[PDB]
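hey can u run this one w/ ZID bound, need the structure tokens asap thx
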Amino acid sequence: AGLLDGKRILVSGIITDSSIAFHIARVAQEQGAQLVLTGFDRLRLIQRITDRLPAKAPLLELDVQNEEHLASLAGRVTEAIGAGNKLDGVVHAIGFMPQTGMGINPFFDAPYADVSKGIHISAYSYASMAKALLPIMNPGGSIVGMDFDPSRAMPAYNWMTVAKSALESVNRFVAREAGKYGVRSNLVAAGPIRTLAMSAIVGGALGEEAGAQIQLLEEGWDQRAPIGWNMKDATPVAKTVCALLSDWLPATTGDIIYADGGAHTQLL
Amino acid sequence: AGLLDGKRILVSGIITDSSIAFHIARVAQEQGAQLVLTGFDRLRLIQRITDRLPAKAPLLELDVQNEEHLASLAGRVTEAIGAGNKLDGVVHAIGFMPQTGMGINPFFDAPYADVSKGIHISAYSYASMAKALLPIMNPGGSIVGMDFDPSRAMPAYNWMTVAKSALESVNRFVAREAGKYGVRSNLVAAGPIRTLAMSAIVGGALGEEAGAQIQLLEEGWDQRAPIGWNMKDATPVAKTVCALLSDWLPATTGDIIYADGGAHTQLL
Amino acid sequence: AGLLDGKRILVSGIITDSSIAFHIARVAQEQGAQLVLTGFDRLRLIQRITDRLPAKAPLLELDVQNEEHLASLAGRVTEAIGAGNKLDGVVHAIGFMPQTGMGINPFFDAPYADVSKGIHISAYSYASMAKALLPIMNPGGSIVGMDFDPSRAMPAYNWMTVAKSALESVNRFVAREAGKYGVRSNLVAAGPIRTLAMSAIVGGALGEEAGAQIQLLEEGWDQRAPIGWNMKDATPVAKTVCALLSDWLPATTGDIIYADGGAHTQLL
Amino acid sequence: AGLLDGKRILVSGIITDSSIAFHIARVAQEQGAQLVLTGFDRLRLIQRITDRLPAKAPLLELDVQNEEHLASLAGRVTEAIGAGNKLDGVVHAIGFMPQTGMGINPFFDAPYADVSKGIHISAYSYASMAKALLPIMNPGGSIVGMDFDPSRAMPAYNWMTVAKSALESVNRFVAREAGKYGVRSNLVAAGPIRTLAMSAIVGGALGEEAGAQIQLLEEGWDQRAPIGWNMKDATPVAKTVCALLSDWLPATTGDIIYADGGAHTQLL
Ligand SMILES: NC(=O)c1c[n+]([C@@H]2O[C@H](COP(=O)([O-])OP(=O)(O)OC[C@H]3O[C@@H](n4cnc5c(N)ncnc54)[C@H](O)[C@@H]3O)[C@@H](O)[C@H]2O)ccc1C(=O)c1ccncc1
Ligand SMILES: NC(=O)c1c[n+]([C@@H]2O[C@H](COP(=O)([O-])OP(=O)(O)OC[C@H]3O[C@@H](n4cnc5c(N)ncnc54)[C@H](O)[C@@H]3O)[C@@H](O)[C@H]2O)ccc1C(=O)c1ccncc1
Ligand SMILES: NC(=O)c1c[n+]([C@@H]2O[C@H](COP(=O)([O-])OP(=O)(O)OC[C@H]3O[C@@H](n4cnc5c(N)ncnc54)[C@H](O)[C@@H]3O)[C@@H](O)[C@H]2O)ccc1C(=O)c1ccncc1
Ligand SMILES: NC(=O)c1c[n+]([C@@H]2O[C@H](COP(=O)([O-])OP(=O)(O)OC[C@H]3O[C@@H](n4cnc5c(N)ncnc54)[C@H](O)[C@@H]3O)[C@@H](O)[C@H]2O)ccc1C(=O)c1ccncc1
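ok here u go:
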């Protein structure tokens, strides 16, 4: 086969071996992609984690709140992949919201400065990364960001859901710019995945009530999904991101693909 | 009749006699409401404008980015309406986005600090105001915010559309808190209205292309609306906000009512 | 007050004193409307039930599957309200699906003839009634149909949910025709209401599983609704239909207003 | 590569060499799929057309309005693919609406019998085919139907848009049944494609106004699509259907993938 054979793809967002971006990177290399990775603050830890990927991949530092990192990103990537080559895919899998904007801290008590940091990292940065990278992307390219369905409110996720609503809207504008380069921009809305942090939260890290509510949310997800949902398995989400990075959804942009077991299409 | 007879309603957002909140205030007083107004920076100008309203209404200063204004808002309103009385309605009609986030300035060139100010004023503040005012609202009360449909991208509005997407998501969370007080929270998504600023923009204030595009957007709106759309008339939008402030939509919250001529329900 | 003062409104759909149309008629007369009622097969029973309405209202027979009834409807209504007068409002509150299309009978086992009857009565008829009545409606008029949110599948409702999906689509086309008359067309999506039939179904009339599932659906509705949901009280739904029949939502058509406690805006 | 290597896929809907199902079949064979085709009435013509496909494929007759064809379909397919083998994919690409339900014939003038035939063929049949075929489908299988976005009304398509709204709702119920077999069910919402019939319609076959409106609809589609839209090329739509038939979107069901150039995500 080789779904992504020959494609050069930048993958951001790996922080632990349970990160959804770690599985996206693994599956993309299994599929023939040549990768460049970006990591945020603990580069030594990230390098050690990505050593377990099937193939080597250069790791570049990128703090999306750092204008300088962003301004120099395209030059560093070109250096990593070689003059004359461009990227075919970009994976944005970054997100963050201060504790005051999630959990049991009341929705009305999150200070704007925390919300703003969260929106900067989780939403604005999708536009930041596309701005930095489209100049070095090939026609037929694909930009994919990680989302979760924020069309209805829900317990605990609070401001992070607002940040996803902003992100879905940013994606539709990025598609307009990306289109001028022959590039698609889309998001994958995933079901809940037991990442290290999510496990910490279910385990009570942000208050017992938030944990109980997240837990309830996960069970209802598998019940509602007509094909079921396994929160411990990120592979189905990684495969979907690879589908969008491939040439097999060439007429979809500014769009959202739901890799959630079909749960969002069922009331109960 | 007297649709809002006896209700005490706070109305924010009046800046000129063409402000949508000026018409909402006028219609609400025609309907029997007793109002309290809040204004942002030019209080002398706002007082002079609101002198033309059918009845008197106390004017309080409120800069939604000022924590102190917000912290003292409930006490000032109680003083204006009298100890022992509470509000039955709150109208949020505030919005703003720096020029870099709208117009012909490229979407990718808006700095985050500008976007963040815009989201603070246009979205977060809906939660700020509800936080400040629910403690002084009566069961059966109603909070209404001004929106425009951001479900699809569009030219020129750029980051302001992202700010509406965030606002619609904030509204669904505010409904959850407001519900504990027996209060509803909803938004009215209006068609384009020729406010002073919008007229300035169509006239070229943010670049000729942005103006031409806004103009095209307005014409297509009236064509698509099965009952037509008159951008020079804010009355149909004011009436809709009054419908939500009344007791005649008592089972709708966390929701959006479209006062746009039905344009959003038609492709062409 | 008098929300509907002086308006002539046709109300279809009354079959028992627990029919949602019975409450819509009662509230509309409390609000000053002069009504004309249509009933389907048991006119003697319907007359006896509507005798309890606050005011008298002529009852006309109308089987929406009868072309002749439809062809003569406008003439009979004009006779009931008097030559030279026209209707200002029309309420469609009719729906039906054979048992094979609902309940525990498997979704795949409903024969098309049953589904087709159900869609004829529940969806096509909204266009049939508008076709018959727009010629005798005044500018500023309003047509309202009863809906329930079919955007996601759910247990038990099966083909009736498909019929609501068709109805919402018919409504957007009827708005286009109604607009030529200066008339609005909208639907009210209600939460579950304990009508006689729904009570029969919860009580097991279409299989124990369907009943258990409907029951579960109702409880979750009140839990999800930020202001709660009372399935035994149709008044909040009647008031919402009256809001659309009034002149207070004059810029909304081809649209759906949710009178469901805000449940559809919350995941959990 | 071989995206569909080894999969057995039934493809319905081929009537001319410009049929979207002809391209779906061609691309699926280019990708390694072994096909079985079904055709509706002119089997001699269909056989002659499919002779041009890259590989041979048995052709079975199937009139979805024929209960007998449906009742015997699974047995005929098993015979064509051999005892002990099951299908991995099913493509529903059938649709039809009598002329009275489309075109310049007024929306209110389509008789229910025509609408009902149209809904039978275009919507109910998606459930009919899944009912017939799930018993002979393998876990991990995929059912895909052709759709066009009916969320807003539009000129000319009239009742066919209502039939798509019904179909999208049927798909969400079929996903629930298909899930019990480990099978996904999804639709691809395509942009306008110049099929023989659509070309006939643009050319005036259903009235000059319908043609002018369809033409306007197509131009606006390419303008709105951030990556553009080529109505003469069905390949991008075929590739998307193959993506859903593959194992690369394994967590999506009861869903709709838009292969429309991203046009539905942009207002203008
Ligand atoms: N359950 C989940 O884990 C989940 C996660 N996502 C998204 O998937 C993406 C990856 O998250 P994950 O793998 O769960 O968590 P993660 O902690 O493994 O990694 C994401 C990255 O955030 C990156 N980071 C933070 N700040 C920066 C910065 N300033 N610059 C660069 N990088 C930064 C960080 O270093 C980390 O690598 C995010 O966009 C998530 O929101 C989408 C859907 C679901 C989800 O949250 C959900 C919620 C409610 N309903 C359904 C689904
Ligand atoms: N066309 C329009 O004018 C329009 C306006 N709205 C909303 O209606 C509301 C009122 O806007 P308007 O009447 O047009 O304009 P406006 O300039 O009259 O007034 C709004 C208020 O913003 C207030 N302001 C700014 N900063 C602050 C602050 N820090 N604290 C307190 N107040 C502040 C300001 O003083 C002013 O009174 C806003 O939420 C708008 O976004 C909603 C829909 C439409 C619209 O923009 C649109 C766009 C695209 N498609 C369809 C419709
Ligand atoms: N729970 C409910 O009772 C409910 C009802 N509605 C709609 O409200 C309307 C009235 O229904 P109801 O009051 O519950 O029941 P009903 O039995 O009182 O009356 C409706 C009418 O159907 C009329 N009828 C049947 N055939 C014909 C015909 N051929 N010609 C003329 N009239 C005919 C019949 O005579 C009866 O008067 C229908 O469109 C319903 O579908 C909308 C929402 C909810 C709902 O079903 C729901 C389901 C799932 N989630 C949320 C909400
Ligand atoms: N533009 C298009 O051609 C288009 C087509 N589709 C769908 O694609 C599918 C294939 O249509 P096509 O390839 O355009 O046309 P087609 O005429 O090539 O073929 C479809 C099949 O209908 C089959 N047929 C009719 N009755 C029966 C029956 N009783 N039993 C079995 N088969 C039957 C017929 O024999 C034919 O093979 C249908 O579901 C379409 O509605 C989806 C989207 C677009 C579209 O219509 C559109 C409209 C508005 N905005 C955007 C897109």
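Chain A has one domain: 1-268. anyway lmk if its weird
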